[PDB]
Amino acid sequence: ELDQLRQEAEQLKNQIRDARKACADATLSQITNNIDPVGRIQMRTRRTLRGHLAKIYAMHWGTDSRLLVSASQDGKLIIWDSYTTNKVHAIPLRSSWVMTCAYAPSGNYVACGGLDNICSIYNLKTREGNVRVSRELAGHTGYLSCCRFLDDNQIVTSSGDTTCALWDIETGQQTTTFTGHTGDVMSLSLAPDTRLFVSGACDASAKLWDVREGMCRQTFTGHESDINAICFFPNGNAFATGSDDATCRLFDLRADQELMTYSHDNIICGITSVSFSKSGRLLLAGYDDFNCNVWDALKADRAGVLAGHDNRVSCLGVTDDGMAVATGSWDSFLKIWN
Amino acid sequence: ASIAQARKLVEQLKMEANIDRIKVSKAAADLMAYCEAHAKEDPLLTPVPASENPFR
Amino acid sequence: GCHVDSRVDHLFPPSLYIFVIGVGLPTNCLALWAAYRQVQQRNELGVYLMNLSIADLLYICTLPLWVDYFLHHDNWIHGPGSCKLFGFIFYTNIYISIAFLCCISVDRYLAVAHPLRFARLRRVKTAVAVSSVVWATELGANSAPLFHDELFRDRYNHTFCFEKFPMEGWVAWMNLYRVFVGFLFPWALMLLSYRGILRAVRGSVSTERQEKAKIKRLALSLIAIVLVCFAPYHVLLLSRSAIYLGRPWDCGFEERVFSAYHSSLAFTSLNCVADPILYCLVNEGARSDVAKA
Amino acid sequence: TEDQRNEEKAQREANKKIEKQLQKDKQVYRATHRLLLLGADNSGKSTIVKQMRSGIFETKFQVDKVNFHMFDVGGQRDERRKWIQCFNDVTAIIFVVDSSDYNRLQEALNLFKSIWNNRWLRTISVILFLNKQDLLAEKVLAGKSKIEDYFPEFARYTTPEDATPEPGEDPRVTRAKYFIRDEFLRISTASGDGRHYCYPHFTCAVDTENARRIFNDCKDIILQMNLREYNLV
C-alpha cells in the first residue's frame, strides 16, 4: 500500500505541475518592461537613534506614525518619539533573544518574543503610566519568528516548528493551528482585511491560510535554498520573498506560481529583510553586504543603495503614512531615511 | 506511520489540485495597477518639503 | 660679557629647523585627523593623539621666528612682549608633546596588559579631563619665565632674545628642571610601557613569531628615535648649567660649547617629525585610516 | 501655551531619566561576556554547565570579578542553520565534540568545518574540549575497532610530545588523540587568516577546569583585538 500511495502522490504532483505549467501564461518581467525606472533613490540619515547597545533584530512602528517600538539583543524594548527624538518609555525584557516585536494598533500594548517560544503582552498606555506585563502566550515548540496584532484582541504567531497559530487575548488559548510546512517558518505578514495571512519557510515553499478555518489553500515553490523574509503587498494580494540563494522572488496567490526574480552575479549573500512602500512601487531589502538595495518591484533593477550601515542590515519598515524608513542593523543603530 | 504520512500528502495534494486557478498575467496587471494608483501619496517616491516633513 | 663664535649657525641649526618645518606639518595634521576619527569610535587614544598633534602644530607654527633668530646672528629684536610669549611657547611645546607621548604609552599598555579591567579609565570623559589637567600643569610649571623681562644680552655686537649666554641664576635651575623633569621621566615611562607590551605580546598563544617580530621592530623604532633626537642637546644643557653654577666667570667654556649648544638645539626638533609618521602612517590599520582620509 | 511648555518639560525629564537608565545599561552590558555551548547528545554538553555552575538553559558564573553568561539552546529541532546566527557577537563559541565512536567523529569534523567556514563564525574563536576522551581512550586501546576502517591514516603516526602524560606510554591512544585533532585542523589551521583559533583541549565530563580555561582563552581573544584596536600590530 505504501508504494501505491507514493505513486499516487507522484502523479498528483505531476498533475499539479501540468496545471501550473498551463496556467503559466507570462511572467512579471514581460508585462512590466515599459514603465519608467524609479532611478537613484538617494536617501539620507535624517535621524540617528543612538540608544541601543547591541544589534537590532526587530523593530515595528505604531499606528500614530510617531511612536515606534524597537527590540535589540541586549534585552530592551525602547519606545521612541520620532518627532522630538525622545524616548517615551524603555521597557526591559525578560528574554534578550528577541526576534520580533509588535505594536498594538490602539497603542495600549506591545508584544515581544523570540527563542523563548513565548509571546508576551505588556501594558503601554496605562492610567498609572508604568509599563507592566499584562499576560503571556504559550504553546509553540519552536522559536518565535514573527507576531502581529490581529485587530485588538487576537494575535497571529509564527514559529520554527513549521506551524502558525491564532490566539485570543482575553482567555489565553490557542484557538486555531496551521500545519503543512516542512521547514522553519521565518517571516509572517497579515492582510489588510485580517482574513488571510502568508508566510515563507526554509524549504523554498510559501503557503496561504484562512484564519476563520484552519486549512491551507495554496503553495508556491520557486527557490533553491531557505526563504527567510516575507511581506504583504498593500492591495491584499501577492507578496515578496528573499532567500539565502541571493535571489529575491515575487509570488502571487491566484497565479499560484513564481513571477519575478531579483538577482545578480556580484551578490553572493542572500536577502534578510523585505518591506514594501505605501504605493508598492519600491521594494526594499537588506543584505549581508552591509547595504540596503532599493529594487523596483516591477523592473528587477538595483535603483538605489542605502549605504551607511557598517554591519549586516537586519531590520526594515515603513510608516503608516509612508513618511520614513527605519533601518535597524547589526551596527546597533537605527536610522530614519527620508 | 509512513502509510499515514503518504495519505496526508496525497489528500493535501488533492485539495491543492482543484483550486480555481486564473492566469498569471491578470495578477501581474493587478500588482502594476495598485503600484501606479498610489504613486503621488508616497513620500519615499516623491520628495516632501521640509515644512511638511517632521524629520527635517 | 662673554665672547661667542660660529659662522654656519647663520644656517646651521636653521638647516634642521627648516627641515622639520617643511616635513612635520602635514604629518601632524593627518595624525590629528586620524586621532579625531579614533575618538569617533569611543577610543580614548584619539584624544591623546589629537593633543599631541595640536602641540606639535603650535611648535611648528612658532618655530620660524626662532629660525630668524640666528639667520641674522643670534640677534632678533621685535620688542619684549613678543619675544616673551614666543620663547615661552617655543620652549614649552617640546615638554607638552613628550608628556602626551607618555600618556599614549600608558594607554597602550593598559589595554594589552589587562584586557578586561580599568573600564572607567578607558573612557573619553577621563581622557578629556586628564588632557586638560596636563595642559594646566604644563603652563603653570613653565610660567616662571613670565615674571622676568626677556630681552637680555651681552655687549659685543649681539642683542639676544629669551637666551642670555652669560646666563642669570634662575635660568640655570630652570634648565636643570627642564632636563631632568621634562625629558627623562616621561621617556623612561614610555620605554617601560613598551617593554611590558612586548612581554605580553611574546607570550601570546594565538600570535606567531612573524607578528611578534613586526611588533618588536615598531616598538624599537618608537623608543629609539626619541633618545637620539633629544639626548645631545640636554647633555650640553646640563653641562653648561653645571659649569656656570660651579664657575660663571669662566667664559671660555661657553666660548667653546656655543657650537655644541645650537648644533644640538637643531637636532632637538626632529621629534616633531618622528612622532606623527611613526604613530599614524606606519600602522596597517592606521594606514587604512589614512586611506579613508 | 503653558501646558505645551509643561508637556515639553515632562518630555525632557523623562528623556533625562531614560538617558541615565541607558547609561547604566551600557555599563552593565559592556562589563559582561556571553558564550554559546554546542555539544552532542552522547557528550556531556550540559554536564559541564552544571559542573561549573522552556527552551534556553541559561547559566551564570564569574571568574576573577568578570561576568560570564552562556546559553544552551536545546529546546529546538534538528535544524541549526538559522538560530545559530543569533550567537555572532559572543566572545567564543564552545563546540563540545563527541569523540566517543568513530562513526560519530565524521559528523564532528563536518560540524567543526561548517562552523569554521561560516559567514558569521569565522571571527569567533571556537574552543575544542574533545569531550568523552575516556570512551575513545578505553576503546581504541581495547581494540575490536580500527580507525583505519573509517579514516585510513591511523598507522602512519607516532606519539605526540607530552599530549596528556599517561601512566601507560601507549602510542595508539595519543596518536589517535592527535589524529582526530589534525582531522579538525585540516580546515582549523588551513582556512582562516588568524581572526580565530582552535585552542585544543582534551576533557572528560569531570574536570572542574573549563570555566578558567574559557576565561584564559577569552583573555587571549581580547588581547588579540586590543592589539588590533590600539594600532600596535
Residue numbers in the entry:
A (entry chain B): 3 to 340
B (entry chain C): 7 to 62
C (entry chain R): 8 to 300
D (entry chain A): 9 to 61, 205 to 384
What does the paper say about this structure?
Among the over 800 known human G protein-coupled receptors (GPCRs), three specific receptors — GPR4, GPR65 (T-cell death-associated gene 8 or TDAG8), and GPR68 (ovarian cancer G protein-coupled receptor 1 or OGR1) — were identified as proton (H+ ion) sensors regulating signaling within acidic microenvironments. The three proton-sensing GPCRs exhibit different responses to extracellular pH variations, and each receptor has distinct preferences for G protein-mediated signal transduction. GPR4, in particular, is responsive to protons and engages with various G proteins, playing critical roles in angiogenesis, endothelial cell inflammation, and cancer cell metastasis suppression. Conversely, GPR65 is activated at relatively lower pH levels, primarily signals via the Gs pathway, and is implicated in chronic inflammatory diseases such as inflammatory bowel disease and certain tumors.
To elucidate the G protein coupling versatility of GPR4, we determined the structures of chimeric miniGs/q-coupled GPR4 activated at pH 7.5 (pH7.5GPR4–Gq) and pH 6.8 (pH6.8GPR4–Gq), and miniG13/iN-coupled GPR4 activated at pH 6.8 (pH6.8GPR4–G13). These structures were solved at global resolutions of 2.9 Å, 2.7 Å and 3.4 Å, respectively. In the GPR4–Gq complexes, the receptor at pH 6.8 (pH6.8GPR4–Gq) adopts a similar conformation to that in the pH6.8GPR4–Gs complex. Furthermore, additional long tube-like densities were observed in the cavity formed by TMs 3–5 in the Gq-coupled GPR4 structures, suggesting potential lipid binding. The intracellular conformational variations result in distinct receptor–G protein interactions on their coupling interface, with GPR4–Gαs forming the largest interface area of 1230 Å2, followed by GPR4–Gα13 (1017 Å2), and GPR4–Gαq (1114 Å2). Notably, L12334.51 in ICL2 is buried in a hydrophobic groove formed by the αN–β1 junction, the β2–β3 loop, and the α5 helix of the G protein, in Gs-, Gq- and G13-coupled structures.
